[PDB]
């Protein structure tokens, strides 16, 4: 049981000695633990998903099941067999030998949006790199996270793993999180989620990288087909009430193809809105100026009624058009993390580009950007569009999600998570994370 | 865009009295190993093959110690015995477990150094062509004989193996598992009883029906799927009623089973297959009738006008399942000339209803002799564990676990599922 | 048995004892609850009973059965009914 700083430092010393002995292990023996842990994690995806849904109070079970499966399979497959123990490269003719060595103790911060997937992700990567981790689960969605941690720890134990490598808080508190965040014995911290925590973790005088996302804009021009863009955006946004990271947050529609796109939303579950209920929802999106949390992963009907309006139950997203103004004060301009969307009314291609830029600095992180256009007739548009934007991912006629027909849409993409940066200020293009960030290399010359 | 497939084993010899002339061409080879079951080993069938081999004279040994399921234990004792023998030829006999287990042990023999788990987790599914597989067939190499009409494991590059300690199921699937050589003779399968005939036939029927409406359904699968479906409707009732007094329907439906095996080897299976697999696993129910009791509700689940709740990519390749069922029915002549889609669908599933009545199966899972207490106790985790079982799955409409239990209870109770 | 009892009192105590004793070991109490299709039960209990008569029972059974009583017992047991007259 971990609720105070006394037992906190007790298990700090415990897992410290545990990692000390664990870091002497050979590659060929950590590999089988890797396999056994990955398989066991991928087995019980659904008890964990059900646990996470009931503890969170919202979300869709099957989305969590499928994302658990995808996470486990992808993280195992991409990191099946990599040389991570002992000597790495050699120049015998020069006697210059370069080995790698692990880092040590790391903290991991867990949000309620993805309480279980991130847990297995960080746990497996840490175990691969012969390092140790402590968890700061969110008080809301914690028991699922703790249960996953015990399950993976036990699967490791029945593989010759040391008595533990995993630590975590019980009943997490801000004081315990700060005490461990400034604890001497930790070497790295991994903070993901809300912008409030990532900047504080940055302001720690210690190594830190935060995986975040900003308002994801998509620009649609006239040479774009309406149906394909509408269908793709609706599926991507409907995925799990729009709680996936780096999800769409505002739409730019050029002048000539505007009203037909609007009525196209009217032809489906998208419920357009142009009246004082835009204000009724603007109040509830942004109650404190800091993203009211009573709409997190909530269906369109529930958020509509808590805004104070009735909406046909079949609807899924609410479309705001009172977005002629472009600045931070727009509740729509902020990311929503809910089945809600505000659109723009653009004039031309370049007005759309400027509006998209004005969106992208608001997030502060260059993560993703969407273009819905004709491809083969406008390559000038493609390359100019790439020049003007600064985000980690550029998609053209592609949803910003994972899973269509067959393999995956797209099959060759990393998740919208795992893309972090070492800075927050501006144009901080988020980057994926690997053991190169998690192992320190040393070399000797003879 | 994407890409798509049609790969088959190179050579099939297939008829009435084909076995001797089939094996004749196996002269130059020297060593051999045999895998089969203990029951058939006791039966006067293995003696036939070993005699035909000794006619040329082959160092041979049989493995008849496979039970109904791959074990992760039997596989390596067999592989160890054969790699002690070191044959260059392997012969598989029967249906299901003897064949794929052979596959496994053979591939284990092919690289006796690689361990199981990396293979197991590395290869679960296709279109995941990342990245490569160790070369196989360099020293030993595979010839296959079916006995049961209703399964396509003789041709598909599929296997599933079970842990003894935990009962963990491991699906392995990629095209190198296809045997080079397949043989479909019918003298072996003339005395097989009812409704084991019905069990296999309905298994294959499910396979075909899911294959046609699969989202991976290429242009190539539809022809032979519809051909097997067309031919089944006249020779299943006779063969079920008549045999071996009817040496016309039995081999024919055997061929239908082979055709289906060809078909879904490219267009993969659907959810009903997985749930039949599981339900048979816990209640010890045979495959072939576990799925059969399901399909009605399944299609009633699938047949929908436009619920865009969990549908994806809807309008690019799959027009509508309802259209597909209507095309099958009218192509099958199961519709009045002036008809709408829905009533064609109705006629179709009514046809399969009276069909399964003709072959003497119950109408509900309780009617199958299943208690309701444990059924309700286990159905909760049954639906969830079925959500993920590679189903995924060419299912056009994505399911959610909630619908699964509704279908399950409807199946346990009867009750045409109409809204 | 109570020290002050008649025979039948002791007898009902006896088979009550066995009743919830065999309750304790989680067994069905009617053969239909044991999972048997009963239409054919009735269909074929008829000859079941006749071979049940002479199947070496014969038998230190103190009393003769006849075909009728066997049938009563079989149906009562299948339904968990108490064979009493």
From TrEMBL, chain A:
Domain Aldehyde dehydrogenase: where?
Answer: 4-400
Entry superkingdom? Bacteria
Stated family: In the C-terminal section; belongs to the iron-containing alcohol dehydrogenase family.
Instruction: Indicate what this protein is called per its UniProt record.
Output: Aldehyde-alcohol dehydrogenase
Q: Which organism is it from?
A: Vibrio cholerae
Instruction: Report which gene this protein is encoded by.
Output: adhE
Q: Which residues of the full protein are shown?
A: 2 to 447 of 894
């Amino acid at each position: 049981p971990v609720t105070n700083l006394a037992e906190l430092d007790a298990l700090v010393a415990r897992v410290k000695a545990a990692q000390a002995e664990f870091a002497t292990f050979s590659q060929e023996q950590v590999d089988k633990i890797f396999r056994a842990a990955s398989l066991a994690a991928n087995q019980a995806r659904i008890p964990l998903a059900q646990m996470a849904v009931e503890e969170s109070g919202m979300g869709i079970v099957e989305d969590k099941v499928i994302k658990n499966h995808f996470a486990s399979e992808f993280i195992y497959n991409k990191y099946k067999d990599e040389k991570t123990c002992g000597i790495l490269e050699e120049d015998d003719n020069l006697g210059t030998m370069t080995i790698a060595e692990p880092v040590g103790i790391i903290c991991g911060i867990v949000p309620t949006t993805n309480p279980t997937s991130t847990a297995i992700f960080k746990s497996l990567i840490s175990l691969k790199t012969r390092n140790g981790i402590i968890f700061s689960p969110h008080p809301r969605a914690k028991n699922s996270t703790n249960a996953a941690a015990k399950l993976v720890l036990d699967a490791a134990i029945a593989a010759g793993a040391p008595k533990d490598i995993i630590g975590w808080i019980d009943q997490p508190s801000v004081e315990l999180s700060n005490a461990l965040m400034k604890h001497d014995g930790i070497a790295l911290i991994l903070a993901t989620g809300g912008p409030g925590m990532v900047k504080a973790a940055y302001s720690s005088g210690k190594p830190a990288i935060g995986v975040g996302a900003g308002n994801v804009p998509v620009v649609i021009d006239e040479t774009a087909d309406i149906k394909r863009a509408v269908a793709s955006i609706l599926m991507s946004k409907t995925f799990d009430n729009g709680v996936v990271c780096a999800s769409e947050q505002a739409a730019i529609v050029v002048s000539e193809v505007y009203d037909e796109v609007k009525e196209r939303f009217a032809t489906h579950k998208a419920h357009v809105l142009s009246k004082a209920d835009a204000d009724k929802v603007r109040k509830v999106l942004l109650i404190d100026g800091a993203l009211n949390a009573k709409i997190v992963g909530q269906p369109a009907a529930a958020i509509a009624e808590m805004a104070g309006v009735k909406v046909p139950a079949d609807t899924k997203v609410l479309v705001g058009e009172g977005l002629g103004k472009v600045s931070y004060d727009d509740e729509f301009a902020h990311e929503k993390l809910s089945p809600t969307l505000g659109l723009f009314r653009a004039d031309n291609f370049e007005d759309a580009v400027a509006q998209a830029v004005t969106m992208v600095e608001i997030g502060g992180i260059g993560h993703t950007s969407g273009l819905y256009t004709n491809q083969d007739v406008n390559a000038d548009r493609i390359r100019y569009f790439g020049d003007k934007l600064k985000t980690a991912r550029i998609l053209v006629n592609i949803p910003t999600t994972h899973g269509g027909i067959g393999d995956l849409y797209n099959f060759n993409v990393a998740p919208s998570l795992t893309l972090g940066c070492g800075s927050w200020g501006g144009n901080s293009i988020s980057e994926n994370v690997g053991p190169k960030h998690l192992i320190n290399k040393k070399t000797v010359a003879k | 865009e994407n890409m798509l497939w049609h790969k088959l084993p190179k050579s099939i010899y297939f008829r009435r009295g084909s076995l001797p002339i089939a094996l004749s061409d196996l002269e130059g080879k020297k060593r051999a190993f045999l895998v089969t079951d203990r029951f058939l080993f006791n039966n006067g069938y293995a003696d036939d093959v070993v005699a035909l081999l000794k006619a040329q004279g082959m160092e041979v040994q049989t493995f008849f110690e496979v039970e109904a399921d791959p074990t992760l234990s039997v596989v390596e004792k067999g592989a160890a015995a054969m790699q002690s023998f070191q044959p260059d030829v392997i012969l598989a006999l029967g249906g299901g477990s003897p064949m794929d287990a052979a596959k496994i042990m053979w591939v284990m023999y092919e690289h006796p150094d690689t361990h199981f788990e990396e293979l197991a987790m590395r290869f679960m599914d296709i279109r995941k062509r990342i990245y490569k597989f160790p070369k196989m067939g360099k020293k030993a190499e595979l010839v296959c004989i079916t006995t049961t009409s209703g399964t396509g494991s003789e041709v598909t590059p599929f296997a599933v193996v079970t842990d003894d300690k935990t009962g963990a199921k491991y699906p392995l699937a990629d095209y190198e598992l296809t045997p080079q050589m397949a043989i479909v003779d019918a003298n072996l399968v003339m005395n097989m009883p009812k409704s084991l005939t019905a069990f296999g036939g309905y298994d294959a029927v499910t396979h075909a029906l899911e294959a046609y409406v699969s989202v991976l359904a290429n242009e190539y699968s539809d022809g032979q799927a519809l051909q097997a479906l067309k031919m089944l409707k006249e020779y299943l009732p006779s063969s079920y009623a008549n045999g071996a007094k009817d040496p016309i329907a039995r081999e024919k439906v055997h061929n239908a089973a082979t055709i289906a095996g060809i078909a879904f080897a490219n267009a993969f299976l659907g959810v009903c297959h997985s749930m039949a697999h599981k339900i048979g696993a816990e209640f010890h129910l045979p495959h072939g009738l576990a799925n059969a009791l399901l399909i009605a509700n399944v299609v009633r689940y699938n047949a929908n006008d436009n619920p865009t709740k969990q549908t994806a990519f809807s309008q690019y390749d799959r027009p509508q399942a309802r259209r597909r069922y209507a095309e099958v029915a009218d192509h099958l002549g199961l519709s009045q000339p002036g008809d709408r889609t829905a009533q064609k669908i109705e006629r179709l599933l009514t046809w399969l209803d009276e069909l399964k009545v003709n072959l003497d199966i119950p109408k509900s899972i309780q009617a199958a002799g299943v208690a309701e207490a444990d059924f309700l106790a286990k159905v909760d985790e049954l639906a969830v564990e079925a959500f993920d079982d590679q189903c995924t799955g060419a299912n056009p409409r994505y399911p959610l676990i909630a619908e699964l239990k509704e279908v399950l209870l409807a199946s346990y109770y009867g009750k045409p599922f109409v809204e």
